[PDB]
């Protein structure tokens, strides 16, 4: 554990004085012993003086064992023996108070490490080693706060409060408690409803997801001082813990027996407050199974005010309590939960940012703290806005703390050398090769001493990271989940989406820019990072872009969902038939869509061809587009304020018969585009509401594959070919001449850039394999697929 | 005993010396004893000098029990007692630490195997036998690395680290650790995410499927030494294990109580790292079922950093924890796991070849290794890309290592002789045949000495097989699953597919070649062996070829799935049974179809008559055609990379149904061909999808069964008939004249090779049976069914 009290360190440094003063090159146990008694007072030092051991008396013994008798003081850092005394002391302070380890613990630790020169000194100077450790103990008590006895009461309260367990107030009368950052507005509202008698019970609703106990510590504090009335005469607050009751049992019946007994003992009523966490599980009400039905006991308890209690339930949970009556709905009555505003969130963080010093990197930096919150709300994007935050500070608060090790100036090399030596050295003694190991050894220890010397030059490795908490660090971690690894993604988004889509560049820059809005925090944090409709034929660049987004935004291509909407018609069921009549709204809500998006929450959701689905599906999607939520299966709210929703649509292809082609003019791209983009725009509305499209952030337009995009998609695919065969040692290339001939297959009025994959199969995969069987090609020869006669021709060029 | 230490062997060879040196023909226990003490100062030898038993003292006793005078030393190999002492020492090396087998064990093993002449030597020379076995032990009875006492302690760390559980650091401090070739990028990505103080929990998601523990051994070492953030101050690494908890219990409640208890002791927080293996089981909730909801305790534990932990999760698990929140959403965070790239895979293998030298059939050959990976990757294809390989190395590194001792050059025959004698010999004395056993013994034992002599002449067959691990070797093991037994299959593929199907030979060579392409590489490793559609009127050769593929490639005639798509079209099969829509895709995806293909991996999947299946069926097939995966039941991804998909159809039926003649025309067939290759192949596209046909690797056209093929199919079938009756001893033949007459049923314009079975049935089975019953023909005589008047006549022949 880092950072201790002086008294420990002080005894240690006194060893170092003895290091040189007796000259022992590695500061032995003899010097440590002298160190303890030379710190004079402080229980370790003091202890030795009690048993009759002066610093003198010790040193007389010490010099008779190693003497002077060294004065070189070579590499005067400790012995491993002495290093053990320190490891032990740390633990003798774990053992005895001190997290910030002190001297006392060090003599205690010494006794533990009763070895060699130390040990023999005291047992020669008529003091048993444990007589010394004893001595420390019997003066010790270490560290204490808010504790010391002198008198307590007994009252009717005695049987009850034991069991079962806990009291926020107790630990706060021995304080370390934090508010924790309000979470203010609940706390008043409970005490009115608590100092009630015919609804003696408050009921807190909402925010789970707030760290309920933070509000509770709020309550604790406020129930003490001083708004409480004589309508709360001598009220004391004890917290329900499910864990102690369930522990030590193996049947439901045993828990209930204990619970029955407890409900009886709460009879100290009119003086007791019970806090009941997770109240719903215990009520057991309604549905298929509300769980354990403690409610039966609970209901009269609540009514009596014996269980004058505070119930912690949630949005849906309340149903399973108001359903019970008339001593569970005649118990409940609700009051409204709160938590730190988005900026306030930031501030909570800051407060224990600096208190990360047991955690370095962070301490500090506000802009970074702010980054933690702000960047997160949109980048995963489903938690609480301060909880998210501190983790980013801290991740980055280590990532960067890590970045020290490799880059101080790159003084990682010192250690590297010391490695190379050790090896040489060691192995040289093992063959021996003695004086030939010797010099390697000398080379080793040259290096070694340098390492430990420069390791406290690597307080620069603290000075690098331990306040560079800055924005960027934080951003990298938020992107890790999903400045630093987010703004290269932002600035170059079109370029990056372009680097995996060359199927419709128009589309790439458009999607890029919308993503850059959201990804820079310029959109609602209650709407997805993108809603889109992609008009045109299937996979013109469409499908490829969904992929390219995963790739660009998250750095993870493996964060892309993909569901075909043409299968979820709901009412285009035979009106645009796709052979799937039953289920459909039940299929998306009831499990499929919703389960999938829960897996990766920042997933490019690719809803293929939404033209073939009726305007009704779009209402479900609308909840994403508005709320940034979907409300579905097993009472989940899946926050779609994350994700990239990308809906492609056959709103193009079906009508489409004009070609967005550069080869028939540039005026053939953008006015055939416009021609389909008009016939599209009435099919757009017919398949997915205008209301839908009104809450869809952007309408991305593609149309049948361009001149120009094909041979670039093909030249990537042919290159995927050239790369996947090279790893296992085969060089293939399709020249530009061959990538061109392959590309011609998709041009289209209705297809897209889908057939390109096949034309790569036929002209590359298939073509190479019929050449390997032939004996045209060989291992690692470059196999050129070129066009020379309007057909592929295989040349060898290696 | 496995190249297991000299000291054993060393004491032993001195026995052989003593064997002849006093004249013992089987080296008795007296010579073994001498061997020990004449080996001077090994543990065995040394011990005896302690017991007072000098080599002299021993030998004096020894010569007085046997001593003289079998100086001829007939064969001198051991006495069976002495062979036991050696067998015992191996166990005595288990017993007294030594992986290898050395001296202590031999004296201890000797005492253990006290026996006659040895035993009497020490008990005559005033030495108790157990005093001796003691004596060896108490000098050496150990071999040690790492561990060895010297005393160290820590305090608060005690209750936690005790419980529960395994410590990777411990085995790495005692150090028997092997890296084992990581899987590096995880370790960094864990340590940012670990060295937090809020989401201080890493969560590893990846292929499991690499051996998660490789990353773990990665972590272990790197968290200790030596560049790690200050957040991770004075860390200790403890791995958790469910297995010890569940053992010795049989009720859930105790396991949970213990989990609560553990959660408490981890309070050494900010100084402890917990590794939670099999994290999923604990997390529970989600889906329709949990997994054990320890999560309740675990979630705050993770947030607190007391259970600052590393979670080793799965595909699905992340969903059911970020769904839980917010000490499970702001706790968890994923990072991407590595595996050794396909070429790298090869290298991992290679690395453990040399250590497969106690397996003595690796190292070598490189080409075999390279192959090990590569041949498996494309076929079988039942595993991930690196695992397959090493298994082949070792398999074949035993198949052939067996071929060592199966044949010497074929000098196995020597031993065979010794046997034949022994039998005769023994039994001859048991009846006796006194001297009539003599010569048999002499012939036997002649053989015997020669046998044991030639068994170490069969170090030559070891130098033959026992390091080789060949391409051929590897191939053979891959064939065992399914070079050597793959390339005869490859080279002759058309011929072999031809040998079971003659029906449209045009089709056979094509199909053959497509398999040979994939099966000889240069196709995506993810993609299937072949996607195809085979058109032609029902079973032209189509079905039969699917069979022939199974037959040829796998060595099993059938290992071929077979589904009729017309029953679950996704088109018209909505309401074939039921009056309402529920059905068709639900069977296909939902389990039925997919489970069947899941059973055999290398399986020709035959989806019959897809002619009027919806475009939807094709999308499902398409996932195979593109990715080479199918997405189905229990959230499993079945990697279609060994399936051979063959979909048959009569989609534009009429045009297919115009023969590929030959025996009628030879040029109307190649004009039916082009014609069926458009109206059919476009109805194919119209009922399927053009995208479907476009990612189908090859569309094979079979016409109606050639006029031509029939008497050759008939000559397989009619002969298959003649062969199935021969097994229980009946010889039937249909002459060429009668096989010609059988072929006549279908000659075809609208039908396949289906009516041929029926016509064999009529013309062979039915025809023989009405003649066997009437006594024209009988058992064990040859039944000629001939034509000699344009109709069958049953003739009799020898």
UniProtKB/Swiss-Prot annotation, chains A, B:
Gene3D superfamilies xref list: 1.10.8.60, Clp, N-terminal domain, P-loop containing nucleotide triphosphate hydrolases, UVR domain
UniProt-annotated binding residues for ATP: 206-213, 536-543
Membrane-spanning segments: none
Pfam families: AAA (PF00004), AAA_2 (PF07724), AAA_lid_9 (PF17871), Clp_N (PF02861), ClpB_D2-small (PF10431)
Repeat 1, as annotated region: 4-69
Domain UVR: 415-450
Record SMART domains: AAA, ClpB_D2-small
Protein name per UniProt: Negative regulator of genetic competence ClpC/MecB
Source species of the chain: Bacillus subtilis (strain 168)
